[PDB]
């Protein structure tokens, strides 16, 4: 189950959105909650696909050596309330409440997230072959679950310097222009991913994020590969804010190495290895709870909570002003007058009830 | 001493060049030996300064964390036959002189290192500033060629400290100055712990050497790779191929630098790493500073030998001319003249002999 306390699929965050959708319906608004997209951006092989996969909480994105992500993967998470059909699933988490559908495969359902991964590899090769070609044409994936928000996440090819295989001379500009399409949207949280085993000032993720978000208002820095740093080096000076500071700060993570991927090590054991690495390192033992994938998921949870609560002032205003109106209108008699007193009274009670639910956030 | 068999300061290479230069000057023939400059280029913190240091064979370049090389270091190695130090290799035959300190001599290569740090701070301070103004260093030794080597600031993407918004273009323009020269070997330095497609060293090298004819890829930090990864596919030529190929190396890590580990122990650690690694054990002769040194030695040897046919031609045609003049003389003036022409013919014979041996 993709339910994960603390993260973007925190049960309380789902409960909050359902409660507000019930309020909006009774007060007569189409739900105005506009959740930002989450977009990962960095140099090629910074570990972007692994960071995005960890936020979703189940494996489905191709990860490996060489050039892997060669088309945008636009994932729509869609909230949907709810056996032989899982005969020869290889996915131990596979269940009838959660599946994927690809736009390019109408009516096919993937309960097995390994098959989602296989399909992303196949659809990539169908359009751009097996010699490093890249296309801006997105692969559109929807994932249905009772435990997710209505939210878009984007995985993107990494920025490169040197064309390989079938890539043209100007591949760097083409990947730069493809990425700007997704992060120029003011409603986009930019996860600027940089490998900790390169100097931060070489980060293409940070350079691009600073071009479109110079105030650093929707950019979180992610430092991958902290386990691969030269002995006695660390990212503490970056976390302490002394080097390219970001308003929203940086989170160091340790994802699976290529040996873990080849050994098919599961996400849960990878999360436990990451906790142990940070609790046992001299330099990260201090405030170790601010290290790792769970802290990045928490940062995102809080931003998403700020977006939902950002709507309440406007709503409190509309509730009280329509409450005042019906109370004034509410000052033997005709079929009209009796019916209208009843409708106005039913309305007053809903707006009281709505006002109560909004106060208790 | 800085003499190192197999590298750019191979004693046989020094002997050969001095012998030919003595011939050219004694017989009146233009010296065509034009040795390329050797220029290191890469991303900031790829390990460029350490690769250049290892080619010279004694420590003198600032290395460490953050932005370290912040001005060009143009080193002229100059061959010179001889007549309170903290440097155990210090000797009266080998010293450095900086243009900006005229007539000061540094026998202690630690002091050379200290002076590069001080002259860097004097012009661009201690908050990451960068200048294209070179620090000009000459190193005098009986054991070196007349050879120019250049260390350069790394290419960066994001300005830090005092750096201006357009620092990337300024560093790119400063580097192109040195590698646009067709007579430059480009050492494109890339950390092995990033995918080669991210190499700024290879991107810049490809702008001036698109055919990849004068570029050696150097892969540093092979000791820092993700467990079970290796650079074998790059060494096998299957990824951005270069005529002159790639050399993997392992330099001192920051802990080695903090512990002041000497160059000799670092070269022995590198040899053991490659002899003992699953992926490199059968190919260890193609690994390390010594293989990079050998590649450079061989290129230099090809340039010297490439000139000899043209030279043999000019020597014999000069010999033919003096022989014709001498046969013209066949009275105290006449006898002196016959002797001078005879002495001249013998020089060119002798010269022709010495060149044929090679
Ligand atoms: N040791 C270690 N290896 C990591 C880490 N994160 C990712 N890797 C390794 O880096 C490689 C790239 O992982 P990946 O998620 O595919 O990176 P990416 O940036 O998406 C690759 P592309 O840009 O081509 O899509 C894999 O070999 C993976 O195991 C990390 O935190 N630690
Ligand atoms: N483990 C390991 N660390 C390396 C390697 N080469 C260099 N380092 C480390 O990388 C850092 C940079 O080394 P340095 O030689 O100064 O690199 P650079 O590219 O010249 C730095 P700048 O671009 O700022 O001048 C130092 O901490 C050094 O010890 C290597 O092969 N292995
Ligand atoms: Mg990827
Ligand atoms: Mg340097």
- A176 contact residues in B (CB cutoff 8 A): none
| Contact present, A36 and A213 (Cβ < 8 Å) | no
Instruction: Point out which residues pair with A159 in neighbouring strands.
Output: A43
* Method by which this entry was solved: X-ray
Q: Which of B75, B72, B92, B64 is nearest to B8 (CA)?
A: B75
Among the atoms of ligand 2, which is closest to the Cα of residue A231? 1
Q: What residues contact residue A18 under an 8 Å CB cut-off, 6+ apart?
A: none
Strand locations in A263-318, DSSP E? none
Q: What residues contact residue B312 under an 8 Å CB cut-off, 6+ apart?
A: B352, B355, B356
What is the rounded CA–CA span in Å between residue B189 and residue B220?
A: 7
Query: How many whole angstroms from A50 Cα to the centroid of ligand 2?
Result: 27
Q: Which of B216, B206, B229, B236 is nearest to A163 (CA)?
A: B206
What is the rounded CA–CA span in Å between residue B186 and residue B39?
A: 5
Q: What is the resolution of this structure in A?
A: 2.5
State whether B240 and A164 contact (CB < 8 Å): yes
- A158 contact residues in B (CB cutoff 8 A): 198
Q: Please count the other Cβ atoms lying within 10 Å of the Cβ belonging to residue A99.
A: 20
Straight-line distance from the first to the last Cα atom of chain B, in angstroms, rounded to the nearest whole number: 26
Q: Which of B229, B335, B253 is nearest to B50 (CA)?
A: B253
Q: Angle B129-B135-B141 (CA atoms, 0-180°, nearest 5)?
A: 145
Give the strands of the sheet with B147-151, arranged side by side: B95-98, B135-141, B73-79, B147-151, B37-42, B184-191, B215-220, B246-248
User: Which positions in chain B have a beta carbon within 8 angstroms of at least one beta carbon in chain A?
Assistant: 43-45, 65-67, 154-160, 191, 193-200, 202-203, 206, 221, 224-229, 239-240, 253-255, 258
Give kind and range of the element (H or E) at residue A347.
Answer: helix A335-359
Spell out which residues line ligand 1, taking CB within 6 angstroms. Answer: A 44-50, 63-65, 67-69, 157-158, 224-225, 227-228, 253-258, 261; B 226
Minimum-distance ligand to the CA of B191? 2
State whether B197 and A244 contact (CB < 8 Å): no
What is the rounded CA–CA span in Å between residue A212 and residue B99?
A: 45
Domain holding A303, by residue range, is 1-361
Query: How many whole angstroms from A62 Cα to the centroid of ligand 3?
Result: 7
* Encoded tokens for B175: 């580097």
What is the rounded CA–CA span in Å between residue A54 and residue A74?
A: 16
Q: What is the DSSP string of B283-333?
A: GGGGSSHHHHHHHHHHHHHHHHHHTHHHHHHHHHHHHHHHHHHHHH---HH
* Sign (positive or negative) of CA dihedral B278, B284, B290, B294: negative
State whether B157 and A262 contact (CB < 8 Å): no
Chain centre distance of CA A232: 33
Query: What burial class does residue A118 get, using C-beta atoms within 10 Å of its C-beta: 0-12 exposed, 13-18 middle, 19+ buried?
Result: middle
Judged by DSSP in three states, A188 sits in strand
Number of domains into which chain B is organized: 1
Chain centre distance of CA A60: 14
Give the strands of the sheet with A219-224, arranged side by side: A99-102, A139-145, A73-79, A151-155, A37-42, A188-195, A219-224, A250-252
Rg (CA), chain A: 24
* Encoded tokens for A277: 């690495």
Query: How many whole angstroms from B19 Cα to the centroid of ligand 2?
Result: 39
Which 3-state string (H, E, C) describes B150-176? Answer: EECCCECCCCCCCCCCCHHHHHHHHHH
Q: Which of A313, A243, A163 is nearest to B161 (CA)?
A: A243
What is the rounded CA–CA span in Å between residue A333 and residue B156?
A: 82
Distances (CA, A) of A259 to A256, A343, B72: 8, 67, 41
Instruction: Point out which residues pair with A79 in neighbouring strands.
Output: A145
Q: Give the CA diameter of chain B.
A: 88
State whether A230 and B255 contact (CB < 8 Å): yes
């Amino acid at each position: 189950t993709l339910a994960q306390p603390g993260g973007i699929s925190d049960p309380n965050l789902i409960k909050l959105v359902n409660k507000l959708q019930d309020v909006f319906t009774t007060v007569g608004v189409n739900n105005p909650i506009d959740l930002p997209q989450i977009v990962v951006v960095g140099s090629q092989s910074s570990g972007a696909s692994s960071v995005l996969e960890n936020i979703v909480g189940r494996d489905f994105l191709p990860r490996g050596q060489g050039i892997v992500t060669r088309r945008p993967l636009v994932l729509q998470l869609i909230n949907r309330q709810s056996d032989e059909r899982l005969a020869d699933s290889t996915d131990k988490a596979a269940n009838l409440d959660e599946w994927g559908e690809f736009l390019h495969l109408p009516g096919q359902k993937f309960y097995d997230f390994n098959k989602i991964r296989d399909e992303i590899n196949r659809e990539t090769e169908a359009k751009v072959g097996r010699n490093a070609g890249i296309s801006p044409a997105p692969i559109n994936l929807r994932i249905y679950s009772p435990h997710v928000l209505n939210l878009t996440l984007v995985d993107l090819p990494g920025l490169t310097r040197v064309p390989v295989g079938d890539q043209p001379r100007d591949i760097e500009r083409q990947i730069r222009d493809m990425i700007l399409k997704y992060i120029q949207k003011p409603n986009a949280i930019i996860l600027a991913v940089t490998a900790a085993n390169v100097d931060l000032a070489n980060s293409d993720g940070l350079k691009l994020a600073r071009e479109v978000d110079p105030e650093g208002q929707r950019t979180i820095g992610v430092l991958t590969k902290v386990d691969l740093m030269d002995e006695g080096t660390d990212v503490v000076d970056i976390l302490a804010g002394r080097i390219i500071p970001l308003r929203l700060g940086y989170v160091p993570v340790v994802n699976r190495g290529q040996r873990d991927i080849d050994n098919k090590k599961p996400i849960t054991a990878a999360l436990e290895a990451e906790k142990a690495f940070f609790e046992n390192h001299k330099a990260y033992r201090n405030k170790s709870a601010y290290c790792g994938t769970p802290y990045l998921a928490r940062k995102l949870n809080l931003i998403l909570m700020m977006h939902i609560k950002q709507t309440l002032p406007d709503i409190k205003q509309r509730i009280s002003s329509s409450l005042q109106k019906y109370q004034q209108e509410l000052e033997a008699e005709s079929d009209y007058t009796v019916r209208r007193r009843k409708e106005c009274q039913q309305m007053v009670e809903s707006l009281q009830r709505a006002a109560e639910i909004v106060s208790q956030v």
